[PDB]
Structures are given as structure tokens and as C-alpha cells.
């Protein structure tokens, strides 16, 4: 029927909008990897490291 063809377009537009609204993510993420950290805690790790 005619509403089926319109429903196809609606389904495409909805998925397009959903993909547009999403945020970037990468496997090789930033500090947010663990994260379980705060700015105060990170300085302790930085200062504790000795080469």
C-alpha cells in the first residue's frame, strides 16, 4: 500500500537522526578508559612515577 512506502522513508529518517545524535567513541579511548579517576588522583600517579 501507499502508507508502506511512506513508512520505509520514516524508518530511514529515524535511523539517520538516531545515528546523527550519537557521540563519537573509539576503541583507543582517552583517560576515560578506566576511568575511575579524578583530577586530584591523577596528579598522585604522575608524581609517583620514577624513571
Amino acid at each position: 500500500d501507499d502508507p508502506y512506502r511512506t513508512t520505509v522513508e520514516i524508518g530511514l529518517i529515524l535511523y539517520g537522526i538516531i545515528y546523527y545524535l550519537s557521540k563519537p567513541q573509539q576503541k583507543k579511548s582517552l583517560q576515560a578508559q578506566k576511568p575511575n579517576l579524578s583530577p586530584q588522583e591523577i596528579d598522585a600517579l604522575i608524581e609517583d612515577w620514577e624513571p
Binding site: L30, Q31, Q33, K34, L37, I42, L45, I46, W49, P51
Partner: peptide, 19 residues
Amino acid sequence: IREQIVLGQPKTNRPWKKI
């Protein structure tokens, strides 16, 4: 540099020997 110091070695998360 900050991120690499924090994370450490891959899959073990032990500190690097040098940079």
C-alpha cells in the same frame, strides 16, 4: 604524555621503564 604516564603498559598497566 599525561595519558601515557597514567595508563602504563598495554594489557598489564604496569609503568613504563622510560620515555
